[PDB]
Each structure stands twice: as structure tokens, then as C-alpha cells.
Amino acid sequence: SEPSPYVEFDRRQWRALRMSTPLALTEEELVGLRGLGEQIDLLEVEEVYLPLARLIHLQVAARQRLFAATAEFLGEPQQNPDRPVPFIIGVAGSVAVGKSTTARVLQALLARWDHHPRVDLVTTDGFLYPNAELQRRNLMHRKGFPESYNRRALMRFVTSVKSGSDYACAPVYSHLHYDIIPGAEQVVRHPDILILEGLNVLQTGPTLMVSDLFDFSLYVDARIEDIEQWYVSRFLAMRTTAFADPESHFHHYAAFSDSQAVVAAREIWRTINRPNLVENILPTRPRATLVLRKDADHSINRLRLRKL
Amino acid sequence: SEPSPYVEFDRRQWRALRMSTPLALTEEELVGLRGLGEQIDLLEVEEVYLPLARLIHLQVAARQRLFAATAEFLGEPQQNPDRPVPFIIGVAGSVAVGKSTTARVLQALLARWDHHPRVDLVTTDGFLYPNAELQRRNLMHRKGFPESYNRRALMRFVTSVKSGSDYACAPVYSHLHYDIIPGAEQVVRHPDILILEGLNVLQTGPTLMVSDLFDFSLYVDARIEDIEQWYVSRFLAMRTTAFADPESHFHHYAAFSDSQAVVAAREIWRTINRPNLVENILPTRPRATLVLRKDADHSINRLRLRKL
Ligand SMILES: CC(C)(COP(=O)(O)OP(=O)(O)OC[C@H]1O[C@@H](n2cnc3c(N)ncnc32)[C@H](O)[C@@H]1OP(=O)(O)O)[C@@H](O)C(=O)NCCC(=O)NCCSSCCO
Numbered sequence A, B: 001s002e003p004s005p006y007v008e009f010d011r012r013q014w015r016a017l018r019m020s021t022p023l024a025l026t027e028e029e030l031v032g033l034r035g036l037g038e039q040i041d042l043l044e045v046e047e048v049y050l051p052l053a054r055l056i057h058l059q060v061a062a063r064q065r066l067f068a069a070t071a072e073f074l075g076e077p078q079q080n081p082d083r084p085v086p087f088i089i090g091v092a093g094s095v096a097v098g099k100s101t102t103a104r105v106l107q108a109l110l111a112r113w114d115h116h117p118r119v120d121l122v123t124t125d126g127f128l129y130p131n132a133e134l135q136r137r138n139l140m141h142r143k144g145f146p147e148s149y150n151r152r153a154l155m156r157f158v159t160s161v162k163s164g165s166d167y168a169c170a171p172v173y174s175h176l177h178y179d180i181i182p183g184a185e186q187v188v189r190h191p192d193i194l195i196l197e198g199l200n201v202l203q204t205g206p207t208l209m210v211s212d213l214f215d216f217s218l219y220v221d222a223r224i225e226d227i228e229q230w231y232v233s234r235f236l237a238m239r240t241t242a243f244a245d246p247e248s249h250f251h252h253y254a255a256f257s258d259s260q261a262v263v264a265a266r267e268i269w270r271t272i273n274r275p276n277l278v279e280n281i282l283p284t285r286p287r288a289t290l291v292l293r294k295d296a297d298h299s300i301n302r303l304r305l306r307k308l
């Protein structure tokens, strides 16, 4: 009889909350959404993601009445073709934990609902300072840490979108060139649902931050030991993948041998990513609305929901 | 064209948001609710508090649909006589800023609405460890700081109430005896609205805290210089008030002269309360849903609302 803000589910119980929700995704489309190293299949989409999509849509509708109440108080006009306040979803997790895939799969699913919602996906890597500013601030070795992002611009972007602005722009990042793409821009136009995915997104602070504007948040979790192993493996697999293309900022890596690669990946992990995870990311897991616990084989078998 | 999560109002503009809301409080009743040193009159109740009560009730109704959505997702029965999820309001501010009064006035106003809501008020001083445990943990000089409260019990209490438990108990504190009253208990029974008032209430942490369960929060603000002066004045006025009664843990103070008192109050303030304000309380003001800015004369002339 010890009340809790959380409710924990094993996959076998969570799958039942799917109810009647239709599966509108083919094994073909899932393939194009799957990230390097991910093992998600159609069954996992069905037993884990479908009930997630249902939970979200139930909340989107209810969350709108809350903002409408504030609008009615201020006496601000609900004029023209009524445009809903965007619903903002934060997706966080460590590097290589698979949050990229999760965000993409969730977008596809959320968009294929009867009322055809406009669902955008924005990765926060577009707000990392360009390498120039990075090495000009002596932060090239802290890329991924909270200080490597233009927190002001990020906050300004999300505030703009949720305030109901007609359009807002976000910088575009290129993982290949390991840097910001000069002049490139992603345009977001009053979406019904905006999904923001990144390492930092749930970070709280002495000031109001982007996480305070989230209407729902998910954390992609795994044992730190397992994440390290996925990191190292994706690293090796990239030698014949991204590191292959000459433009790659890490071409010199595509040549490494299985032995050197492992030693190289583990250090980058030990000195840069692991510290960031432990110090900045893991501390936000307690506040996430929904935690997705992955197992050694990438499979999500456990979930923790905040009902309070 | 710089979007903001905040909206600032001068009293003259805020007063207009009262709309038709009836004033159901007499100057007589207001007298009994007013704390030592407070200057709140019926006009202030009308121009500042009435629109506040209206904002809250508009939100109470909308907030219920949100929890209902989660309930519908989990497939949990909306059985019997439908009992709403309690709406939790946090009221924070420094010592002597006047938050006690604000909380009491707000309770009275919220309760006198057409549907007769059950509105309870719980001060968190009932969760301060007894002086015994305090001096047993070497914290008697940090009374009021976050470490002086039983954060676990406080969180357990609020979680219990909002989870829908039939009843929950909170310890009772006695300002006179400067300590917890052994055996005394305040019983809270599934209220429609629960108001929690204290110094710590908005504190965030590495773990889920009481502030994460709040549905609305207000911060009672004033210039630190002015708060210091109110502290010192209330102190002097208490010599002939509370410090008079022999039981008072500070009887020896009722004898002090205007000169000594001032020097004594200022040090307690300088060494205990001011530090707590600067280090633990002020840092939470950015997250409060509504900030009430008091002026040197205790009058509230400015407000800052989070519409996002
Ligand atoms: C740039 C930054 C901060 C980006 O963080 P993210 O949260 O986006 O990383 P995350 O693991 O989520 O990857 C997101 C996507 O970005 C992909 N990606 C990551 N690094 C590269 C890359 N170098 N080239 C091409 N694609 C890449 C990754 O495979 C995901 O794509 P898929 O959804 O198709 O699978 C991080 O990857 C980084 O480089 N941190 C500095 C420390 C470090 O790891 N240095 C070694 C760089 S080469 S090893 C590649 C794995 O880090």
C-alpha cells in the first residue's frame, strides 16, 4: 500500500494496451526507418510502439483544453481557422542507445492517424555550435555536452513553435562532415506535434529550459555496459559504412583494423560519451514521462510510466 | 517579435481579468486571515486575487481531463461516485515575504465557488524534523534549509493524496514551541484542491520531488532588501506578541530593547534566512506558474504568468 508516481510494465502486459489501434506500417517501411545496429521488427512496433502512439494521441487532445483554458482567461481570440497549440515531445537517451530510430518510428506512427496530424521531427544536433565556435571556445573535446549546444537558440526555436508562429527555422547538422551545414535550414510550420530528439533535451536548469515546454517525454534506457558495447560495434561497422565515403570527417578510420578500432572507440567512449551520459543524461531519467528499457539484444522488454 | 513563455502584467491590467467573478469575502473575514505585518485590503483581494481564483478554476477543470486520458489508456475503472484527481497548488517564497497570508486568502476564495469545492491547506513546516532529530543531525542552525525537512514523508504524503487515497496524515508544527507537536496530526481527505505552502516546495532535484506533482505554482516575490526589513520589523513586533507568552521558545526575546532586537534579528537573517533564500528559494522563481511581485509597502503591483 505504498503509492507511487510510477507504474511499471513488462512488455507482455504493456502489449495489451494496444486495444483496437491499427498497424499502418509495413516491414518494408520499417527497414528504411531502422538505424545502424537496431534490431526493431514489426512485432516490437506492435507490442511496444502502438500502445505508445495510442497513449500520446489520447493526451494530445486533453492537453489542448489546458492551453485553451489559459487563452480563455487572458481573453485572447480563438480566431480564424482554429490552430491548436503544438504538442511537444522530447526524446532523450545516450549516444548509440537507439533514440534516433525510436523518434523516427514514433513520427511515422503518430502521423498515420485518422485525422492526419502534421508531425515534424527535429534533431537537436542542428543546434550544436559549428566546429569553428567549438574550437574557438575550447570545447571540441566536449561535443555532445550541454555547453556544446546553443541553448538560447534551441529554446527560442521551441518557444516560437509552441507560441503559434507561422514558421520557425532550425540549423541542419551533417553527421558525415561532423559539422553544421552553412546556410542549410529546416523549416517547421505550425505542426500538430513536434518531436525533438537529442542528448540534452531533458536537461533542467537555473533558468527555464526546453524541457519545461515538453508536453510528454521519453527516455531510451539500457545498461551502461550494453550501450558501450553497441557504441563500439557501430563504430567498427561504420568503417565499411560512413567512414568509407572520402568526405567523412573520419575517413582515416575506415582503414583501422578490428583491433585498433576497438581500442579507439573505447577511449572516445571512456573519455567523452560515458562521462556525458553519467553526468548529464542519466540524471534526467527520473523525470521522463516514459522510460523504454532496452535489453542486451536491443529489444525493449520493460517500461516505466509516470501516471503522476 | 521575440516570443516568450512569460506574460507580464501591471496590476492595472491584471485587474481587468476579473470579469464577472463575485467577491465573496468581507473586510471582517479578511482581518482574521491577515498575517502579522501584512497590508492586504479588500481592494487588493479584488484586483489581484479574484482574477487569480478565476484562472485556477478554469485550469482545475481542464487538468482533470488530462489525468482521465491516462486513466482511459490504462483501462482503469472510472467507478462509483466519480472522484476527481486532486489539483495540487504549490505556494512558495522567503520567510516573512507573506506567503502564509497569500495561501490562506487563496484557500478561502477557491472554496467559495458555485460548486463548493473541498479545499485544504497544508503548511510544510509540519514536515520539518523535530528539533531532536535536528540537533541529532547537527542541523539546528539550518532550520528551513532543504535538509531540515523529511523530504521522503512530504513526497509520500502528496503522492498519497493525488493517487486518490481515502485519507492521508501530515504532522503538525507549532511556531510557538518552535517544534513538532508530538502525536498531533492533520487529516486530509480526498480534497478537490490541495494547497501546499512552504519555503522548499518548488525545489527540484536529482530525483522526482513534490514540485513535479504540482498542477500550479505561485511564488511570492519581493526585493531581498525589503524582505530583510519586514523580517526585522515582524521580529520587533513579536516581542509584545508571540515572544510574550511564556511558553514561547523565544520568551527571552520579548525583553530585548529596540536596539538589541534589531541587531539580533539581522544576524539570524544574515546567517540563516538570507542564505537559504539566495541559495535554495530564489533559484526556483523561474519555474513558478505565477510570480506575485510585492513592493516595499507589501502591495502586489506586478505579476508574471507562464502561458507556456
Ligand atoms: C555528434 C554527436 C554529438 C551526435 O550525437 P547523437 O545523439 O546524434 O548520436 P546518435 O548515436 O544518436 O546517432 C544519431 C544518428 O547519427 C548517426 N551518426 C553518428 N555519427 C555518425 C557519423 N560520424 N557519420 C554518419 N552518421 C553518424 C547515427 O548512426 C544515427 O543514425 P541512424 O539513426 O541512421 O542510426 C556524437 O555522435 C559525437 O560525435 N560525439 C562526439 C564523441 C564521439 O562519439 N566521437 C566519435 C565520432 S565517430 S564514432 C560514431 C558514434 O559516435
Ligand SMILES: CC(C)(COP(=O)(O)OP(=O)(O)OC[C@H]1O[C@@H](n2cnc3c(N)ncnc32)[C@H](O)[C@@H]1OP(=O)(O)O)[C@@H](O)C(=O)NCCC(=O)NCCSSCCO
Residues within 6 Å of the ligand: B034, B035, B036, B037, B094, B095, B096, B097, B098, B099, B100, B101, B125, B143, B144, B175, B176, B178, B198, B199, B234, B235, B242, B250, B268, B272, B273
Ligand atoms: C520555523 C521556520 C523555518 C518557519 O518558516 P515559515 O516559512 O513558516 O516562516 P513564515 O515567515 O512564512 O511564517 C509563517 C507563519 O508562522 C509565524 N511565525 C513565525 N515564527 C513564529 C514564532 N516564533 N512564533 C509564532 N509564530 C511564528 C509567522 O508570523 C506566520 O504567521 P502569520 O501567517 O499569522 O503571519 C522559520 O520561521 C524559522 O524559525 N527559521 C529559523 C531561522 C529564524 O528565523 N530564527 C528566528 C526565530 S524567531 S523570529 C520570527 C520570524 O522568523
